[PDB]
Amino acid sequence: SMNPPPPETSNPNKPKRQTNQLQYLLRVVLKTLWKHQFAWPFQQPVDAVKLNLPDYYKIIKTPMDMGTIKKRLENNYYWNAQECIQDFNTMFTNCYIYNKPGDDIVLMAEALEKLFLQKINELPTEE
Ligand SMILES: Cc1noc(C)c1-c1cc(O)cc([C@H](O)C2CC2)c1
């Protein structure tokens, strides 16, 4: 059994910025989700070997997780907030695509996603 390489978190030739919106995504959005009781399955890439999910990376072709997003934010990987918001949405969508309604992991994702939506509703206007 084999995991793919993780998503990219470093690329010196990708242009990047540290906008007030990106700072909010780290300080408010990531921090809020990371500390939640249901964060743990989302704090690193899905390990299809350890979890015995040999079909996971056949079904999910754009993997994403908050460990990756945390590294991207800490490393100032992004150009804009939309890039980062897309990563959170990819993470949630992947979970809904792979799993069944009512599974524990789906309930966990839905709780995180409610908080995510509440926090990005107050994304600040760009400085
Ligand atoms: C994310 C994700 N997407 O699909 C699956 C399956 C997971 C997943 C990842 C984990 O690191 C651990 C678990 C456990 O089953 C948790 C729910 C009790 C699930």
JSON list of C-alpha atoms and ligand atoms in Angstrom, two decimals:
[
{"chain": "A", "resi": 1, "resn": "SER", "atom": "CA", "xyz": [0.00, 0.00, 0.00]},
{"chain": "A", "resi": 2, "resn": "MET", "atom": "CA", "xyz": [1.16, 3.54, -1.01]},
{"chain": "A", "resi": 3, "resn": "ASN", "atom": "CA", "xyz": [0.38, 7.16, -0.21]},
{"chain": "A", "resi": 4, "resn": "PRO", "atom": "CA", "xyz": [1.07, 9.86, -2.84]},
{"chain": "A", "resi": 5, "resn": "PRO", "atom": "CA", "xyz": [3.50, 12.67, -2.12]},
{"chain": "A", "resi": 6, "resn": "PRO", "atom": "CA", "xyz": [1.77, 15.41, -0.06]},
{"chain": "A", "resi": 7, "resn": "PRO", "atom": "CA", "xyz": [0.59, 18.65, -1.68]},
{"chain": "A", "resi": 8, "resn": "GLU", "atom": "CA", "xyz": [3.23, 21.29, -2.31]},
{"chain": "A", "resi": 9, "resn": "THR", "atom": "CA", "xyz": [3.97, 23.62, 0.65]},
{"chain": "A", "resi": 10, "resn": "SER", "atom": "CA", "xyz": [7.15, 25.31, -0.59]},
{"chain": "A", "resi": 11, "resn": "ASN", "atom": "CA", "xyz": [8.01, 26.70, -4.05]},
{"chain": "A", "resi": 12, "resn": "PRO", "atom": "CA", "xyz": [10.55, 29.52, -4.19]},
{"chain": "A", "resi": 13, "resn": "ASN", "atom": "CA", "xyz": [9.55, 30.72, -7.59]},
{"chain": "A", "resi": 14, "resn": "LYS", "atom": "CA", "xyz": [5.81, 31.00, -6.79]},
{"chain": "A", "resi": 15, "resn": "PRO", "atom": "CA", "xyz": [5.05, 34.68, -6.03]},
{"chain": "A", "resi": 16, "resn": "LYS", "atom": "CA", "xyz": [3.59, 35.24, -2.62]},
{"chain": "A", "resi": 17, "resn": "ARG", "atom": "CA", "xyz": [2.22, 37.87, -0.25]},
{"chain": "A", "resi": 18, "resn": "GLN", "atom": "CA", "xyz": [1.16, 38.37, 3.33]},
{"chain": "A", "resi": 19, "resn": "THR", "atom": "CA", "xyz": [-2.19, 40.26, 2.96]},
{"chain": "A", "resi": 20, "resn": "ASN", "atom": "CA", "xyz": [-4.44, 41.23, 6.01]},
{"chain": "A", "resi": 21, "resn": "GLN", "atom": "CA", "xyz": [-6.92, 38.66, 4.66]},
{"chain": "A", "resi": 22, "resn": "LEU", "atom": "CA", "xyz": [-4.29, 35.92, 4.73]},
{"chain": "A", "resi": 23, "resn": "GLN", "atom": "CA", "xyz": [-3.29, 36.93, 8.28]},
{"chain": "A", "resi": 24, "resn": "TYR", "atom": "CA", "xyz": [-7.00, 36.53, 9.28]},
{"chain": "A", "resi": 25, "resn": "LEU", "atom": "CA", "xyz": [-7.08, 33.10, 7.63]},
{"chain": "A", "resi": 26, "resn": "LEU", "atom": "CA", "xyz": [-4.16, 32.04, 9.92]},
{"chain": "A", "resi": 27, "resn": "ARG", "atom": "CA", "xyz": [-4.97, 33.86, 13.15]},
{"chain": "A", "resi": 28, "resn": "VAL", "atom": "CA", "xyz": [-8.74, 33.36, 13.15]},
{"chain": "A", "resi": 29, "resn": "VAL", "atom": "CA", "xyz": [-9.84, 30.68, 10.68]},
{"chain": "A", "resi": 30, "resn": "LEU", "atom": "CA", "xyz": [-7.08, 28.04, 10.88]},
{"chain": "A", "resi": 31, "resn": "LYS", "atom": "CA", "xyz": [-6.62, 28.58, 14.62]},
{"chain": "A", "resi": 32, "resn": "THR", "atom": "CA", "xyz": [-10.35, 28.17, 15.32]},
{"chain": "A", "resi": 33, "resn": "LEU", "atom": "CA", "xyz": [-10.66, 24.91, 13.36]},
{"chain": "A", "resi": 34, "resn": "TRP", "atom": "CA", "xyz": [-7.34, 23.46, 14.52]},
{"chain": "A", "resi": 35, "resn": "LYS", "atom": "CA", "xyz": [-8.25, 23.57, 18.22]},
{"chain": "A", "resi": 36, "resn": "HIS", "atom": "CA", "xyz": [-11.69, 21.97, 17.77]},
{"chain": "A", "resi": 37, "resn": "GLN", "atom": "CA", "xyz": [-12.39, 18.51, 19.20]},
{"chain": "A", "resi": 38, "resn": "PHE", "atom": "CA", "xyz": [-13.06, 17.19, 15.67]},
{"chain": "A", "resi": 39, "resn": "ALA", "atom": "CA", "xyz": [-9.88, 18.61, 14.07]},
{"chain": "A", "resi": 40, "resn": "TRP", "atom": "CA", "xyz": [-7.62, 15.59, 14.45]},
{"chain": "A", "resi": 41, "resn": "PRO", "atom": "CA", "xyz": [-8.52, 13.62, 11.29]},
{"chain": "A", "resi": 42, "resn": "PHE", "atom": "CA", "xyz": [-7.90, 16.80, 9.26]},
{"chain": "A", "resi": 43, "resn": "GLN", "atom": "CA", "xyz": [-4.57, 17.87, 10.81]},
{"chain": "A", "resi": 44, "resn": "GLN", "atom": "CA", "xyz": [-2.42, 15.88, 8.30]},
{"chain": "A", "resi": 45, "resn": "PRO", "atom": "CA", "xyz": [-2.81, 14.22, 4.89]},
{"chain": "A", "resi": 46, "resn": "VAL", "atom": "CA", "xyz": [-5.02, 11.12, 4.78]},
{"chain": "A", "resi": 47, "resn": "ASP", "atom": "CA", "xyz": [-2.77, 8.12, 5.41]},
{"chain": "A", "resi": 48, "resn": "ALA", "atom": "CA", "xyz": [-4.47, 5.53, 3.21]},
{"chain": "A", "resi": 49, "resn": "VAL", "atom": "CA", "xyz": [-1.99, 2.85, 4.37]},
{"chain": "A", "resi": 50, "resn": "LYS", "atom": "CA", "xyz": [-2.52, 3.22, 8.14]},
{"chain": "A", "resi": 51, "resn": "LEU", "atom": "CA", "xyz": [-6.33, 3.73, 7.67]},
{"chain": "A", "resi": 52, "resn": "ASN", "atom": "CA", "xyz": [-6.66, 0.82, 5.19]},
{"chain": "A", "resi": 53, "resn": "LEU", "atom": "CA", "xyz": [-8.31, 2.98, 2.53]},
{"chain": "A", "resi": 54, "resn": "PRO", "atom": "CA", "xyz": [-6.65, 1.59, -0.63]},
{"chain": "A", "resi": 55, "resn": "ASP", "atom": "CA", "xyz": [-9.21, 3.30, -2.92]},
{"chain": "A", "resi": 56, "resn": "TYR", "atom": "CA", "xyz": [-8.86, 6.77, -1.31]},
{"chain": "A", "resi": 57, "resn": "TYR", "atom": "CA", "xyz": [-6.36, 8.21, -3.78]},
{"chain": "A", "resi": 58, "resn": "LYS", "atom": "CA", "xyz": [-8.16, 6.61, -6.74]},
{"chain": "A", "resi": 59, "resn": "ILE", "atom": "CA", "xyz": [-11.27, 8.65, -5.84]},
{"chain": "A", "resi": 60, "resn": "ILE", "atom": "CA", "xyz": [-9.62, 11.81, -4.43]},
{"chain": "A", "resi": 61, "resn": "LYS", "atom": "CA", "xyz": [-7.28, 13.37, -7.01]},
{"chain": "A", "resi": 62, "resn": "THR", "atom": "CA", "xyz": [-6.86, 16.81, -5.31]},
{"chain": "A", "resi": 63, "resn": "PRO", "atom": "CA", "xyz": [-6.10, 15.93, -1.68]},
{"chain": "A", "resi": 64, "resn": "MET", "atom": "CA", "xyz": [-6.04, 18.67, 0.94]},
{"chain": "A", "resi": 65, "resn": "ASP", "atom": "CA", "xyz": [-5.84, 18.86, 4.75]},
{"chain": "A", "resi": 66, "resn": "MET", "atom": "CA", "xyz": [-5.28, 21.44, 7.48]},
{"chain": "A", "resi": 67, "resn": "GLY", "atom": "CA", "xyz": [-1.69, 20.31, 8.13]},
{"chain": "A", "resi": 68, "resn": "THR", "atom": "CA", "xyz": [-0.91, 21.39, 4.55]},
{"chain": "A", "resi": 69, "resn": "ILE", "atom": "CA", "xyz": [-2.91, 24.59, 4.89]},
{"chain": "A", "resi": 70, "resn": "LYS", "atom": "CA", "xyz": [-1.10, 25.39, 8.19]},
{"chain": "A", "resi": 71, "resn": "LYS", "atom": "CA", "xyz": [2.28, 24.95, 6.47]},
{"chain": "A", "resi": 72, "resn": "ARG", "atom": "CA", "xyz": [1.16, 27.04, 3.50]},
{"chain": "A", "resi": 73, "resn": "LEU", "atom": "CA", "xyz": [0.04, 29.85, 5.76]},
{"chain": "A", "resi": 74, "resn": "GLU", "atom": "CA", "xyz": [3.14, 29.72, 8.00]},
{"chain": "A", "resi": 75, "resn": "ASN", "atom": "CA", "xyz": [5.41, 29.64, 4.93]},
{"chain": "A", "resi": 76, "resn": "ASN", "atom": "CA", "xyz": [3.49, 32.52, 3.26]},
{"chain": "A", "resi": 77, "resn": "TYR", "atom": "CA", "xyz": [2.84, 30.22, 0.25]},
{"chain": "A", "resi": 78, "resn": "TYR", "atom": "CA", "xyz": [-0.30, 32.01, -0.99]},
{"chain": "A", "resi": 79, "resn": "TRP", "atom": "CA", "xyz": [-0.81, 35.07, -3.21]},
{"chain": "A", "resi": 80, "resn": "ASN", "atom": "CA", "xyz": [-4.36, 35.71, -2.05]},
{"chain": "A", "resi": 81, "resn": "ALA", "atom": "CA", "xyz": [-7.13, 34.65, 0.38]},
{"chain": "A", "resi": 82, "resn": "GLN", "atom": "CA", "xyz": [-9.14, 32.92, -2.34]},
{"chain": "A", "resi": 83, "resn": "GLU", "atom": "CA", "xyz": [-6.34, 30.37, -2.88]},
{"chain": "A", "resi": 84, "resn": "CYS", "atom": "CA", "xyz": [-6.49, 29.43, 0.79]},
{"chain": "A", "resi": 85, "resn": "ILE", "atom": "CA", "xyz": [-10.30, 29.42, 1.02]},
{"chain": "A", "resi": 86, "resn": "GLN", "atom": "CA", "xyz": [-10.25, 27.04, -1.96]},
{"chain": "A", "resi": 87, "resn": "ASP", "atom": "CA", "xyz": [-7.93, 24.69, -0.05]},
{"chain": "A", "resi": 88, "resn": "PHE", "atom": "CA", "xyz": [-10.41, 24.53, 2.90]},
{"chain": "A", "resi": 89, "resn": "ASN", "atom": "CA", "xyz": [-13.28, 23.90, 0.49]},
{"chain": "A", "resi": 90, "resn": "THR", "atom": "CA", "xyz": [-11.32, 21.15, -1.27]},
{"chain": "A", "resi": 91, "resn": "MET", "atom": "CA", "xyz": [-10.68, 19.51, 2.08]},
{"chain": "A", "resi": 92, "resn": "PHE", "atom": "CA", "xyz": [-14.39, 19.49, 3.00]},
{"chain": "A", "resi": 93, "resn": "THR", "atom": "CA", "xyz": [-15.55, 18.42, -0.46]},
{"chain": "A", "resi": 94, "resn": "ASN", "atom": "CA", "xyz": [-13.12, 15.53, -0.60]},
{"chain": "A", "resi": 95, "resn": "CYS", "atom": "CA", "xyz": [-14.51, 14.26, 2.69]},
{"chain": "A", "resi": 96, "resn": "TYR", "atom": "CA", "xyz": [-18.11, 14.43, 1.39]},
{"chain": "A", "resi": 97, "resn": "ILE", "atom": "CA", "xyz": [-17.14, 12.77, -1.94]},
{"chain": "A", "resi": 98, "resn": "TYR", "atom": "CA", "xyz": [-15.28, 9.83, -0.40]},
{"chain": "A", "resi": 99, "resn": "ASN", "atom": "CA", "xyz": [-17.53, 9.06, 2.61]},
{"chain": "A", "resi": 100, "resn": "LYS", "atom": "CA", "xyz": [-21.27, 8.32, 3.15]},
{"chain": "A", "resi": 101, "resn": "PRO", "atom": "CA", "xyz": [-23.85, 10.68, 4.71]},
{"chain": "A", "resi": 102, "resn": "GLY", "atom": "CA", "xyz": [-24.03, 10.19, 8.40]},
{"chain": "A", "resi": 103, "resn": "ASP", "atom": "CA", "xyz": [-20.52, 8.69, 8.75]},
{"chain": "A", "resi": 104, "resn": "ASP", "atom": "CA", "xyz": [-18.64, 10.06, 11.78]},
{"chain": "A", "resi": 105, "resn": "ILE", "atom": "CA", "xyz": [-16.05, 11.79, 9.61]},
{"chain": "A", "resi": 106, "resn": "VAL", "atom": "CA", "xyz": [-18.78, 13.60, 7.65]},
{"chain": "A", "resi": 107, "resn": "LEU", "atom": "CA", "xyz": [-20.34, 14.88, 10.91]},
{"chain": "A", "resi": 108, "resn": "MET", "atom": "CA", "xyz": [-16.88, 16.09, 11.95]},
{"chain": "A", "resi": 109, "resn": "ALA", "atom": "CA", "xyz": [-16.34, 17.87, 8.63]},
{"chain": "A", "resi": 110, "resn": "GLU", "atom": "CA", "xyz": [-19.81, 19.49, 8.87]},
{"chain": "A", "resi": 111, "resn": "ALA", "atom": "CA", "xyz": [-19.00, 20.89, 12.35]},
{"chain": "A", "resi": 112, "resn": "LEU", "atom": "CA", "xyz": [-15.69, 22.35, 11.15]},
{"chain": "A", "resi": 113, "resn": "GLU", "atom": "CA", "xyz": [-17.30, 23.68, 7.97]},
{"chain": "A", "resi": 114, "resn": "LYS", "atom": "CA", "xyz": [-20.01, 25.51, 10.00]},
{"chain": "A", "resi": 115, "resn": "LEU", "atom": "CA", "xyz": [-17.27, 27.34, 11.89]},
{"chain": "A", "resi": 116, "resn": "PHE", "atom": "CA", "xyz": [-15.32, 27.99, 8.73]},
{"chain": "A", "resi": 117, "resn": "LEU", "atom": "CA", "xyz": [-18.38, 29.60, 7.12]},
{"chain": "A", "resi": 118, "resn": "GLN", "atom": "CA", "xyz": [-19.03, 31.75, 10.19]},
{"chain": "A", "resi": 119, "resn": "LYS", "atom": "CA", "xyz": [-15.43, 33.01, 10.21]},
{"chain": "A", "resi": 120, "resn": "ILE", "atom": "CA", "xyz": [-15.10, 33.67, 6.46]},
{"chain": "A", "resi": 121, "resn": "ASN", "atom": "CA", "xyz": [-18.40, 35.63, 6.54]},
{"chain": "A", "resi": 122, "resn": "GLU", "atom": "CA", "xyz": [-16.32, 38.24, 8.45]},
{"chain": "A", "resi": 123, "resn": "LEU", "atom": "CA", "xyz": [-13.24, 38.12, 6.24]},
{"chain": "A", "resi": 124, "resn": "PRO", "atom": "CA", "xyz": [-11.95, 41.70, 6.42]},
{"chain": "A", "resi": 125, "resn": "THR", "atom": "CA", "xyz": [-11.87, 43.98, 3.44]},
{"chain": "A", "resi": 126, "resn": "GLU", "atom": "CA", "xyz": [-8.41, 44.04, 1.89]},
{"chain": "A", "resi": 127, "resn": "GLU", "atom": "CA", "xyz": [-5.95, 46.69, 3.35]},
{"chain": "B", "resi": 1, "resn": "LIG", "atom": "C1", "xyz": [-10.22, 12.98, 6.66]},
{"chain": "B", "resi": 1, "resn": "LIG", "atom": "C2", "xyz": [-10.83, 11.70, 6.12]},
{"chain": "B", "resi": 1, "resn": "LIG", "atom": "N1", "xyz": [-11.48, 11.59, 4.94]},
{"chain": "B", "resi": 1, "resn": "LIG", "atom": "O1", "xyz": [-11.90, 10.34, 4.84]},
{"chain": "B", "resi": 1, "resn": "LIG", "atom": "C3", "xyz": [-11.57, 9.66, 5.86]},
{"chain": "B", "resi": 1, "resn": "LIG", "atom": "C4", "xyz": [-11.97, 8.21, 5.90]},
{"chain": "B", "resi": 1, "resn": "LIG", "atom": "C5", "xyz": [-10.87, 10.48, 6.73]},
{"chain": "B", "resi": 1, "resn": "LIG", "atom": "C6", "xyz": [-10.25, 10.15, 8.04]},
{"chain": "B", "resi": 1, "resn": "LIG", "atom": "C7", "xyz": [-8.94, 10.58, 8.32]},
{"chain": "B", "resi": 1, "resn": "LIG", "atom": "C8", "xyz": [-8.33, 10.31, 9.55]},
{"chain": "B", "resi": 1, "resn": "LIG", "atom": "O2", "xyz": [-7.04, 10.79, 9.75]},
{"chain": "B", "resi": 1, "resn": "LIG", "atom": "C9", "xyz": [-9.03, 9.56, 10.48]},
{"chain": "B", "resi": 1, "resn": "LIG", "atom": "C10", "xyz": [-10.36, 9.17, 10.21]},
{"chain": "B", "resi": 1, "resn": "LIG", "atom": "C11", "xyz": [-11.18, 8.46, 11.20]},
{"chain": "B", "resi": 1, "resn": "LIG", "atom": "O3", "xyz": [-12.09, 7.52, 10.59]},
{"chain": "B", "resi": 1, "resn": "LIG", "atom": "C12", "xyz": [-11.98, 9.42, 12.10]},
{"chain": "B", "resi": 1, "resn": "LIG", "atom": "C13", "xyz": [-13.44, 9.69, 11.78]},
{"chain": "B", "resi": 1, "resn": "LIG", "atom": "C14", "xyz": [-13.09, 8.88, 12.99]},
{"chain": "B", "resi": 1, "resn": "LIG", "atom": "C15", "xyz": [-10.96, 9.46, 8.96]}
]
